[PDB]
Amino acid sequence: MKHSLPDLPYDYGALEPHINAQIMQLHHSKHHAAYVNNLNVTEEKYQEALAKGDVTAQIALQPALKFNGGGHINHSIFWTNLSPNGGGEPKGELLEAIKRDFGSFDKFKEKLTAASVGVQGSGWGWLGFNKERGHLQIAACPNQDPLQGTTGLIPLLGIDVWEHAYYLQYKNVRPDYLKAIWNVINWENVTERYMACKK
Amino acid sequence: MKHSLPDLPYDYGALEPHINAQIMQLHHSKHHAAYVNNLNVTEEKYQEALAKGDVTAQIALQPALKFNGGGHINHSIFWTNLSPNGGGEPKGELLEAIKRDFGSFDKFKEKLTAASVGVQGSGWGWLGFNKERGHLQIAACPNQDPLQGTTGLIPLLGIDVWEHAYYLQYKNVRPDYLKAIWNVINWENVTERYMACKK
Amino acid sequence: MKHSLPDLPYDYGALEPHINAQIMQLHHSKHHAAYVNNLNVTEEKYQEALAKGDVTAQIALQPALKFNGGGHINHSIFWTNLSPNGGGEPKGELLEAIKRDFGSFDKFKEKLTAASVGVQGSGWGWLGFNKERGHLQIAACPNQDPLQGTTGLIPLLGIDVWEHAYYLQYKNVRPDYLKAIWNVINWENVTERYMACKK
Amino acid sequence: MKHSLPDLPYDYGALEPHINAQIMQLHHSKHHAAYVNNLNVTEEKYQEALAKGDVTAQIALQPALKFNGGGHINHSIFWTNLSPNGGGEPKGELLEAIKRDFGSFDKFKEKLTAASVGVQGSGWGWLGFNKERGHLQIAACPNQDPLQGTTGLIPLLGIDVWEHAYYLQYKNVRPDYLKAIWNVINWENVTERYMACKK
Ligand SMILES: [Mn+2]
Ligand SMILES: [Mn+2]
Ligand SMILES: [Mn+2]
Ligand SMILES: [Mn+2]
């Protein structure tokens, strides 16, 4: 298919002072760019392996496909989850769901914060939608393992907790990065993803 | 190119009393057949996903491809590793390599036996060839994960220690199964795989 | 406090024709006994390592502790989940919860059956209780990994799908074993575990 | 036992300009300090669980013990592997082993460099000693999984490739950090670790 690096929907500095411009420029133009490129490389090798029926070659490529393929997915969603006009709380049916499933908005933040802080190593924190049960669910994933591909849950809000997402600004203090990132969350997109899961 | 269940090179009862016909008949005609057929199904689903660039669908299918693809691979080699004319010890350059890398033939047996008994759950014990280092190496693998695809080693001799491989005859006592199987090892084939990697 | 193999609450043949006596006799007196004894051995080695602060020795032993410790746990619950007076459906608050969380009793069976058949390799299928969310949840676990220790869910009903649990009687056809086992499920005990978590 | 943060054997800035002082101060006083403290917390909970025979509690703590316990080990070794007087190449029996097992010193650097660059996520690159085979071996480990505890190999040289080890200075360009770190390698310690493995 030939995957492409999506244009960022805002200037690299639109999220200051919560997430500085230096990070956004590295995260999009270097890190995300690397996942896409290698993903394109990986898929071409796999197409060859399928045509030859080289099952060994297919399995050796799996780690690279899940890693870079996941990277493309997770960051492509992540950018839309942030916005200079973001922050505050959601409204409408999403807020009603957060109240029902978690009790309140502040308790949801605490649990998703804890999931993101609890990730041991590199990974992501996620708010997702469980189609089968029809309710919200928090989950964490290691490295770039994607939410939907590995768990079946539909991503609504993702928090990147790889050190490159915050270290330059917040150093080892991951909890400050989590507290600041709530200021730029684009609940308008999260709502769309939530409403999309329902008929 | 569709994958097919290979014919067994000997009668189902050619390995009695070491491995009874009921095991060999179920192991080949029931267990192996299902991995192959399902692999063909998975490869069709995967090819569809690759053509659309659906990275989510590709990642969700990986387990079924590694499991059944590995199952097809592992059993296809396993059958060639056994023969009614087998047993005894190898000769030639293979025996010289086993002496050099493991000390003696009896020490290699202890090491591969120990690795195979050590599998916690289902898996396989393997003697393999490390191309980069140019020597023999034993490894164990879980479920139907294939050796070469996950480790880079070239499979020479595989021991299936899934319970369906022996339970009917030896029940829970895997060490009795391991003791019996050495009498039907096709050292003529193991040598062929070994000499092929060297040049 | 040393761990001990619990006595089976019924004769080895009390579950015929659903689970023959030969399976029950091997499963309890051979398989379960080994996990317990080895667990006692592992705990002694681990206690020695902890007292010396040998973190290396502690980490190297973790697999043996999770495997045999889980094996002891899982089987000790499994035996209580079966009874010759079992079968049929549950009643009371447990049945109401199954209807609310899964739709109906027949839908819960399909979901737990599907989860148990889906185990690739050895493992267990579980119905569990999520304390935080306060509802039922199905999960599968590999090898002898215990439910509560790895997921936080309280085990209510476990289905052992290790091949030694059924192969002698049903051979490779796990769906026949799953079909038969529902007739001996001790819904009286499953309820007791459920009501204990609620207050 | 009560583990303690070892004093660093040199000033935070003794490795400039290869590894700046800001990193060394964060890496030792914040990151390494966190692993120790939580490790002490984890071991106390485990001592309680062993005395009560709470096997569930033991397994729930395993991730925390391997993570922080490994962190203490890996960094405690890492500091001794660097030195302001470091760099260059080793001599004596270690260099002879590197020539025999890898071909040359430059080829060893390429392979250990590649292993360190290849780590997907957080982890470590290692040169180790295989006691059984009596030769050197390169391996990578994810997160803080320790070499000896998980593979049996004796650590000789470890390369920390967690992003916090280099990002502030080298940003996303991990390969530059690897090229620079060769300038401060304390081969005097690596030799001691190597000679210790031999009688
Ligand atoms: Mn990222
Ligand atoms: Mn098999
Ligand atoms: Mn069992
Ligand atoms: Mn570190």
- In chain D, what are the domain boundaries? 21-81, 92-197
Compute how many other C-beta atoms are within 10 angstroms of the C-beta atom of residue C16: 14
Tokens 């499963």: give the residue. C27
CB-CB: which of B142, B167, B172 is closest to C121?
A: B142
Q: What is the torsion angle, in degrees rounded to the nearest 10, for the CA atoms of residue C66, residue C72, residue C77 and residue C82?
A: 130
Separation in Å, CA B51 to CA A63, B37, B78, C164: 20, 22, 34, 42
Length of chain A: 199
Q: Which chains touch D (3 or more CB pairs under 8 A)?
A: A, C
3-state class percentages of chain D: helix first, strand second, coil last, to nearest 5: 60, 15, 30
Residues D125, A8: Cα–Cα separation, whole Å? 34
Taking CB atoms and an 8 Å limit, are C3 and D53 in contact across chains?
A: yes
Taking CB atoms and an 8 Å limit, are B58 and A70 in contact across chains?
A: no
Residues of chain B neighbouring A72 (CB-CB closer than 8 A): 55
Separation in Å, CA B117 to CA B24, B82, B139, B157, C122: 21, 19, 12, 15, 15
Supply C40's token pair: 């006692």
In this structure, which amino acid lies at residue B138? Answer: I
Ligand located closest to A167 CA: 1
Residues C43, C60: Cα–Cα separation, whole Å? 13
Contacts (Cβ under 8 Å, ≥6 apart) of A165:
A23, A27, A177
Question: D61 CB near a chain A CB, below 8 Å?
Answer: no
Compute how many other C-beta atoms are within 10 angstroms of the C-beta atom of residue B69: 27
Would you say C28 is a known binding-site residue?
A: no
Contacts (Cβ under 8 Å, ≥6 apart) of D96:
none
**Residue B126's beta-bridge partner residues?**
B139, B158
Whether C144 contacts C68, CB under 8 Å: yes
Give the Cα-Cα-Cα angle B36, B56, A27 (nearest 5 degrees).
135
Residues of chain D neighbouring C57 (CB-CB closer than 8 A): 149
Whether A19 contacts A167, CB under 8 Å: no
Q: 3-state DSSP call for residue C173?
A: coil
- Give the gap in angstroms from C-alpha B152 to the nearest C-alpha of chain A: 8
Question: Given the DSSP bridges, would you call strands D135-142 and C154-160 parallel, antiparallel or unpaired?
Answer: unpaired
Cα of B174 vs centre of ligand 4, distance in Å, is 42
Residue A14 phi/psi, 5-degree rounding, is: -70, -15
Whether A32 contacts A74, CB under 8 Å: no
Q: Which residue of A has its CA nearest to B40?
A: A53
Residues C154, C136: Cα–Cα separation, whole Å? 9
Residues D119, C131: Cα–Cα separation, whole Å? 37
DSSP E strands in chain D: the ranges are 123-130, 135-142, 154-160
Whether C39 contacts D130, CB under 8 Å: no
Taking Cα atoms as reference points, which of B42, B61, B70 lies closest to residue B141? B70
What resolution in Å is listed for this PDB structure? 2.3
Residue burial B129-157, b: 16+ Cβ < 10 Å; e: rest: bbeeeeebbbbbbbbbbbbbbbbebbbbb
Taking Cα atoms as reference points, which of C101, C88, C103 lies closest to residue C194? C101
Taking CB atoms and an 8 Å limit, are A56 and B149 in contact across chains?
A: yes
Ligand located closest to A27 CA: 1
Q: Which chains touch C (3 or more CB pairs under 8 A)?
A: B, D
Ligand located closest to C73 CA: 3
Question: B163 CB near a chain C CB, below 8 Å?
Answer: yes
Cα of D106 vs centre of ligand 2, distance in Å, is 44
Separation in Å, CA D189 to CA D72, D82, D130: 18, 9, 18
- Give the gap in angstroms from C-alpha D108 to the nearest C-alpha of chain C: 27
Judge: domain B21-81, CATH 1.10.287.990: yes
Residues C139, B175: Cα–Cα separation, whole Å? 32
Q: How was this structure determined?
A: neutron
Cα of C158 vs centre of ligand 2, distance in Å, is 25
Cα of D197 vs centre of ligand 1, distance in Å, is 40
Residues C104, A3: Cα–Cα separation, whole Å? 44
What DSSP string runs through C123-143? Answer: EEEEEEEETTTTEEEEEEEET
Would you say B164 is a known binding-site residue?
A: yes
DSSP code, position D163: G
Residues of chain B neighbouring C164 (CB-CB closer than 8 A): 163, 167, 171-172
Cα of D122 vs centre of ligand 1, distance in Å, is 13
Taking Cα atoms as reference points, which of A79, A98, A193 lies closest to residue A138? A98
Question: B59 CB near a chain A CB, below 8 Å?
Answer: yes
In this structure, which amino acid lies at residue D157? Answer: L
Supply B16's token pair: 């009695």
Tell which CATH classification among 3.40.50.1370, 3.30.420.40, 3.55.40.20, 3.90.1150.10 matches the domain A92-197: 3.55.40.20
Cα of C63 vs centre of ligand 4, distance in Å, is 25
Q: What is the largest CA-CA distance in chain A?
A: 54
